Ligand binder design. Sequence first.
Ligand code: MG
Ligand code: NI
Ligand code: NI
Ligand code: NI
Ligand code: NI
Lengths: 79, 131, 139, 78
Amino acid sequence: KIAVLVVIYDHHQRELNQRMIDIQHASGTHVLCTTHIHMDEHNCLETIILQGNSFEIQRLQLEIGGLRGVKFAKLTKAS
Amino acid sequence: IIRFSVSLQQNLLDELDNRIIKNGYSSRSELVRDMIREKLVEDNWAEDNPESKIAVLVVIYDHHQRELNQRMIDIQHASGTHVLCTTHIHMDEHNCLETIILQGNSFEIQRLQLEIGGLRGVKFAKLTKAS
Amino acid sequence: SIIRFSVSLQQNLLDELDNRIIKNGYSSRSELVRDMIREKLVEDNWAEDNPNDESKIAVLVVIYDHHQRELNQRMIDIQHASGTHVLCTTHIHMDEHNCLETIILQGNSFEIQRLQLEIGGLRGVKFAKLTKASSFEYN
Amino acid sequence: KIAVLVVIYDHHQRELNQRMIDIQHASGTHVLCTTHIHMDEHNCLETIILQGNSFEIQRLQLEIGGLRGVKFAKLTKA
Ligand SMILES: [Mg+2]
Ligand code: NI
Ligand code: NI
Ligand code: NI
Ligand code: NI
């Protein structure tokens, strides 16, 4: 399975990027790459693309989805 | 921070519970948090008026399908939506995945998703709406 | 009926949710939320890959113009090549340029949903929407 | 304007049909017709098609949704 996680987060939350990076390096999944754009002055949008088993993918969204300053983390899956 | 009460029929609470397992949520509230956060984006998209909403279109397609990539270019150009960025993954010989960050109004963005998805050689097209 | 239980949640997130109650046409928080969860558990139950599961029930509601040539047959053909089983369809002649159909369908969630997308994309079809029935609701 | 109510209900609940019929005849809406099929040995599925203002339509779903033996009443509007 390949998946894409879309994350919207607070631009002013300090150290949040670091945490998100720690998580993705610790992850059992294979993260192919991430892309970041400013939506505006307050919010960044992030696309994380990944391959792995659905269990390891789910844990990634939960770990990320729970951080403070994360507005949301939405998963899309394909076969 | 803060706790509040909800009333659910029995059969719905059990399914929620079951779903907590199937998906590996730690708590009930973690999954309700998730439902709310996505219900809010959904209600922001349905239904204001004018721009400038953000969405991510995820697309899987076969690059051996002739003209398709240019069909997608043309279709997007005639849409009124603005592409902010696209990432492309060469998955294998016969699959490409694209994430296309789009800005515009909800109607044009959604119409674009249906148009792209209807194209031959397009195996998967899915929108993730943002707010 | 009814089992109360608790949800822990960021303050700001509850306010944002609370400001939906009236706009969505609801009178209380409970009713809004309880419907959100019902709708999400169903979608989630349908967003699940179980390749041979023909027990699922859905109602497809369609509005279209009968003046559009070939369309009705396109719908017949599309449904025939879908693997879904039609149990029944009611048709209302609304006026000169509008027919409404309620099609009761049985099959697996993927084929049923694919059918909704296919019909909805046809020219002359003005409206096509699925009402899903999931088994935790009635079984 | 035009709406469809989908209702799944308990096949073994006695007098429920009557109640559902009383309610639709009493209703402020114009009910065009209803269709019933057995989903299995325990559950019936019912499609009610109606025209009316959203207020009268909403009250129909609530009144039907509230009966005993009714598993659910889901509304679609066009
Ligand atoms: Mg190829
Ligand atoms: Ni910045
Ligand atoms: Ni490629
Ligand atoms: Ni007709
Ligand atoms: Ni019977």
